[PDB]
Design a protein that fits this description.
homodimer; about 375 residues; alpha/beta; Aspartate Aminotransferase, domain 1; Aspartate Aminotransferase, domain 2; 2 domains; seven-stranded mixed sheet; three-stranded antiparallel sheet; 14 helices; about 40% helix; globular; binds pyridoxal-5'-phosphate; binds magnesium ion
Chain lengths: ~375, ~375
């Protein structure tokens, strides 16, 4: 049937201004198809566990077991005997008191914020913190106060003005790969009587003792109120989790709308995560190699005069406007380097990022090639870098 | 660390008013543990497919295959070669032009509404429509105009007053099991130049030719703009889908925040759905049996004086306030009948429901037993039904 004018107008306008403008007629994030020979730096699977035979075996085994039909809200599954062992193990892993499974990192953040916020609750959020955190705050009708990226001085002034609130940060930032000043943030939380929420999606598994994370690495675990993470990065699974050093996870399952009104992870999924955790705990070798390759790439690109703000395995090439970003993308892909285009609504219109996500399967030769491709891009490329 | 007052006060109040007041000290939804002999009416797996040997085998096999590391946004996977066969099959199944997979039914609704709504778009939503639709409208900053349940007069008045917009309904309602007046809603949409969105979460698989849904059953497919569904009901899988009789699914992947910022389903998950679809297509006998059992139950309960608004496999026992609901729940569970308590925020505080979700494994003896238990419950004097 015919669409009403206001919907048709929106779709017509969108296709013109987001698909039709680009050379290939597709959205800016969609370039050319990658060949087997190309270097792919797009996946969040940092320790290259997507195809791990032990994970696949345990997941298949658990699925083939007699399946109880648990197609329902997790609200109904909160009796002690119905809660999955993975929660207790992830809590022990990170050093937090309690863990609660969620269907996504997005839902973990939205759910936690809905539970701990009242309307007009002060939420002090890093300008570059994940969209799920910004949205979580917005859905709860909290008062969001952005602070300049990693700027503790700016943060202090905001809390001085508005009073006690929730300080919200990524441990490692999704677009830039910068690291939050977690120690200073803990100090500030104490200095002003705030709660701290740290999203460790990009540090859990890759950082800390046995991959326990950045809070564990810095010995700050017992001074942080909340941590969250997508399990779709290093844990290579479509899920999320909320950790609390308090009783909040007793309440989340009955308060969070995504936790109430969206279906639970099935029991076999929880079992697969148990194996993933064991593999991650022992993956000292992969973590070290990733760390070394990441440092090499950061040093190599910084030498070219490129702005590389990263301190991690996530490297952000800052490519300015969309037209320029299309050029940089086309050049890199033409020379066998496939990153991820980060544009609006993930960034502002004129501050786009081509994100290179490193994983432990990337070797010295590939690292050298990336620097080589970027060097030719700086010197011979008909485009700029911010 | 101890929580600051602004959180602690909320949590304290919540525990007091939602956990402490109940006899067992737990949330209202949490009763006693069921025995293997008990009648369990809690799962949305209407055709009892959770333990189907063929589905399990297809998933495990596709899981054990060589997996590509696709842990990223689905926006990066919108090339024709990256889009799954299940989407084309599901579109043919329902008779809709195009289908787009989502991570949940919740995400399907939230994403679609974000794509087709502008700020202040009129959204005419049934009082009892699923929370995901209410929230999808709220996130999009749409103007919600709630209409009395299944009340086309109230809807007509609202659209005359506020103008063209989007009419949003469940085909079969999640708490009451009532059926939307879909033919009349199609007429109203045409008369007033509105778009119609129908959530078929509770009719897809159970109703229509080969389980194609209620729109298909009524021959209304080609007159409806959008249909959505959780695949976590009859399809017994943690996913959702958006169907369009237009070009909107071209745009959803790049606009919807869950589609953009949350990880996609993996290829093996899609293959599992293909097998599930085939089984559902041929499950005529299961559909027929469920339909017969559900009618038998509604007849049996309604003659006892209970209000039973249902016309489907979802049967809502209307139990009034929370104190009454607790007593009803306890009686039913003590006598071997386990439904799901639906209370706030899913219902009003004084209009709680104990939902009986029937499935095709339920037999005549069990239906007779439920009727017997409720017959004795009516005469017991400890509580009431509405
Ligand atoms: C009518 C209706 N729509 C959407 C959903 C969302 O389903 P899902 O569990 O796949 O998120 C459900 C609730 O779970 C539902 O009952
Ligand atoms: C920092 C951060 N937090 C949370 C999420 C949400 O992850 P998920 O894909 O599991 O919804 C992501 C985005 O993918 C992320 O990068
Ligand atoms: Mg990310
Ligand atoms: Mg439901």
């Amino acid at each position: 049937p015919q669409l009403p004018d206001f919907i048709q107008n929106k779709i017509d306008h969108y296709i013109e201004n987001y698909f039709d403008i680009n050379k290939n007629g597709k959205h800016l994030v969609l370039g050319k198809q990658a060949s087997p020979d190309d270097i792919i730096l797009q996946s969040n699977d940092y320790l290259a566990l997507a195809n791990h035979p032990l994970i696949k075996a345990r997941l298949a085994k658990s699925l083939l077991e007699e399946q109880q039909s648990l197609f329902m809200s997790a609200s109904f599954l909160q009796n002690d005997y119905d809660k999955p062992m993975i929660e207790k193990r992830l809590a022990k892993f990170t050093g937090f008191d309690e863990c609660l499974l969620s269907q996504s990192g997005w839902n973990a953040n939205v759910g936690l914020l809905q539970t701990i916020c009242q309307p007009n609750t002060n939420v002090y959020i890093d300008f570059f913190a994940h969209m799920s955190l910004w949205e979580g705050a917005r859905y709860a009708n909290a008062q969001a106060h952005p602070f300049m990226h990693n700027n503790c001085d700016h943060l202090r002034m905001l809390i001085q003005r508005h009073g006690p609130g929730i300080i919200v940060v990524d441990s490692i930032y999704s677009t830039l790969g910068t690291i939050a000043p977690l120690a200073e943030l803990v100090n500030i939380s104490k200095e002003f009587g705030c709660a701290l929420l740290v999203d460790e999606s990009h540090s859990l598994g890759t950082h800390g003792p046995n991959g326990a994370g950045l809070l564990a690495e810095l010995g700050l675990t017992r001074e942080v109120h909340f941590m969250t993470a997508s399990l779709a990065k290093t844990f290579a699974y479509r899920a999320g989790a909320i950790w609390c050093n308090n009783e909040v996870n007793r309440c989340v399952p009955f308060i969070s709308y995504p936790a109430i009104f969206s279906s639970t992870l099935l029991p076999y999924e929880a079992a697969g995560l148990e194996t993933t955790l064991e593999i991650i705990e022992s993956a000292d070798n992969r973590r070290q190699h990733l760390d070394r390759m990441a440092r090499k790439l950061r040093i190599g690109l910084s030498q070219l005069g490129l702005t590389i703000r990263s301190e991690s395995q996530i490297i952000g090439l800052e490519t300015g406007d969309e037209r320029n970003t299309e050029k940089v993308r086309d050049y890199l892909e033409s020379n066998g380097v496939f990153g991820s285009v980060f544009c609006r609504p993930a960034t502002s219109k004129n501050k786009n990022i081509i994100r290179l996500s490193l994983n432990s399967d990337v070797n010295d030769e590939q690292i050298a090639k990336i620097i080589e491709v970027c060097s030719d891009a700086v010197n011979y490329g008909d485009f700029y870098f911010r």
